[PDB]
Amino acid sequence: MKTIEVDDELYSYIASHTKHIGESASDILRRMLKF
Amino acid sequence: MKTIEVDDELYSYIASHTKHIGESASDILRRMLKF
Amino acid sequence: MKTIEVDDELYSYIASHTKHIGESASDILRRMLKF
Amino acid sequence: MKTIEVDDELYSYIASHTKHIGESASDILRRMLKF
Amino acid sequence: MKTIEVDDELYSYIASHTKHIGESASDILRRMLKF
Amino acid sequence: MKTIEVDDELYSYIASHTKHIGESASDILRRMLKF
Amino acid sequence: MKTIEVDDELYSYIASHTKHIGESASDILRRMLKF
Amino acid sequence: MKTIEVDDELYSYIASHTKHIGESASDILRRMLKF
Ligand SMILES: [Ca+2]
Ligand SMILES: [Ca+2]
């Protein structure tokens, strides 16, 4: 696992894309990025 | 811990209210209900 | 339909908001939120 | 199953005693009375 | 006025608590519940 | 600034998208997402 | 520190070799060369 | 054309790889990276 820092606005943006409650940031980003 | 059944639309609505990536449904609902 | 987990205290809190005997969690939560 | 009439206030009072989402009025009243 | 359905056994139980002939289910329950 | 965890593979994937040497993860992700 | 000029295509090529977000051109080039 | 910042030691290292007097940094780096 690696740590990344994002600006507050970008963090909220990512968190709001949660589709499965409690899922990791990796699952969200992978879904948003199509990766 | 108790399990609850909600319709799909309501589930997505709740999940989209995640403020802290990976937080539980309890933390989201408590925040949404101000309880 | 989707399933979610909530702490015992929160579950009781929601249950106690029943206004129509035998109604679903969705009906209760949707009323509690204003949606 | 038999049907009984109750005043609005009494109905709300009973409904608010729900402990298990979706449970019947018989389960609630039996719990409230101890029988 | 609201309608509630109770199991046969519970209905008889409630009816047997009549203290004033011809009284409503609300009067009986209110008395049995101390409400 | 807030901190998020990402799997190693995802980190490398994001890092490789650098277009301006030394730029932040926020600049990269915002570009990758279009927001 | 010293400054050098590189064609756009080469710059992008180097940038894309970022392995640690926000690292300097020196860190990237030194890794790419084996030095 | 884009500008890059490198440490002094790395700059001298690159300059010492000149094969054609007066050639650019791009030509040297491209040759060194086989790109
Ligand atoms: Ca019913
Ligand atoms: Ca940094």
Side-chain angles (χ1 to χ4, degrees):
Chain A
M1 285 294 292
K2 293 240 196 302
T3 268
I4 294 184
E5 51 174 25
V6 293
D7 61 74
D8 296 351
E9 199 184 277
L10 176 59
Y11 181 102
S12 298
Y13 183 68
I14 295 177
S16 67
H17 278 72
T18 300
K19 292 295 187 293
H20 301 332
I21 297 177
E23 73 184 323
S24 67
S26 296
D27 299 323
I28 304 177
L29 286 173
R30 277 168 179 291
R31 188 167 56 249
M32 287 173 86
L33 301 181
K34 285 92 187 188
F35 178 78
Chain B
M1 280 290 285
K2 298 231 181 316
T3 266
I4 274 168
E5 186 177 64
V6 297
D7 60 62
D8 299 348
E9 185 185 70
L10 178 59
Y11 180 97
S12 299
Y13 183 67
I14 295 175
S16 73
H17 275 72
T18 299
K19 301 305 182 197
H20 304 279
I21 300 179
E23 70 187 326
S24 68
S26 295
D27 294 303
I28 299 178
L29 287 173
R30 280 169 175 290
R31 190 167 56 242
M32 286 172 88
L33 308 171
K34 292 114 187 178
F35 170 76
Chain C
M1 311 301 299
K2 282 251 170 179
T3 272
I4 82 174
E5 281 189 343
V6 296
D7 60 62
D8 295 348
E9 183 192 12
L10 178 56
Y11 181 99
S12 301
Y13 182 67
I14 294 173
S16 67
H17 277 77
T18 295
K19 293 292 183 294
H20 297 293
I21 294 175
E23 73 188 324
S24 65
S26 294
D27 285 11
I28 306 179
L29 285 172
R30 283 174 174 286
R31 190 168 53 239
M32 304 187 264
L33 297 170
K34 283 46 148 300
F35 192 84
Chain D
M1 286 289 325
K2 276 185 172 48
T3 259
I4 75 175
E5 279 179 24
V6 293
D7 62 76
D8 298 335
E9 196 188 75
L10 180 54
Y11 181 102
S12 299
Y13 184 66
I14 297 173
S16 68
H17 276 75
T18 297
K19 302 299 183 215
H20 302 282
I21 299 178
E23 72 186 326
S24 59
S26 298
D27 285 5
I28 302 178
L29 281 172
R30 278 170 179 285
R31 195 168 51 237
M32 286 173 91
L33 307 161
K34 288 100 189 189
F35 157 87
Chain E
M1 285 294 292
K2 293 240 196 302
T3 268
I4 294 184
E5 51 174 25
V6 293
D7 61 74
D8 296 351
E9 199 184 277
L10 176 59
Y11 181 102
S12 298
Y13 183 68
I14 295 177
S16 67
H17 278 72
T18 300
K19 292 295 187 293
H20 301 332
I21 297 177
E23 73 184 323
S24 67
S26 296
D27 299 323
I28 304 177
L29 286 173
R30 277 168 179 291
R31 188 167 56 249
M32 287 173 86
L33 301 181
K34 285 92 187 188
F35 178 78
Chain F
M1 286 289 325
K2 276 185 172 48
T3 259
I4 75 175
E5 279 179 24
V6 293
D7 62 76
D8 298 335
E9 196 188 75
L10 180 54
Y11 181 102
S12 299
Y13 184 66
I14 297 173
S16 68
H17 276 75
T18 297
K19 302 299 183 215
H20 302 282
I21 299 178
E23 72 186 326
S24 59
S26 298
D27 285 5
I28 302 178
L29 281 172
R30 278 170 179 285
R31 195 168 51 237
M32 286 173 91
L33 307 161
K34 288 100 189 189
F35 157 87
Chain G
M1 311 301 299
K2 282 251 170 179
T3 272
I4 82 174
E5 281 189 343
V6 296
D7 60 62
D8 295 348
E9 183 192 12
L10 178 56
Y11 181 99
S12 301
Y13 182 67
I14 294 173
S16 67
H17 277 77
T18 295
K19 293 292 183 294
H20 297 293
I21 294 175
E23 73 188 324
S24 65
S26 294
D27 285 11
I28 306 179
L29 285 172
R30 283 174 174 286
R31 190 168 53 239
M32 304 187 264
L33 297 170
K34 283 46 148 300
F35 192 84
Chain H
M1 280 290 285
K2 298 231 181 316
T3 266
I4 274 168
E5 186 177 64
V6 297
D7 60 62
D8 299 348
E9 185 185 70
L10 178 59
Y11 180 97
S12 299
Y13 183 67
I14 295 175
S16 73
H17 275 72
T18 299
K19 301 305 182 197
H20 304 279
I21 300 179
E23 70 187 326
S24 68
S26 295
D27 294 303
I28 299 178
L29 287 173
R30 280 169 175 290
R31 190 167 56 242
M32 286 172 88
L33 308 171
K34 292 114 187 178
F35 170 76

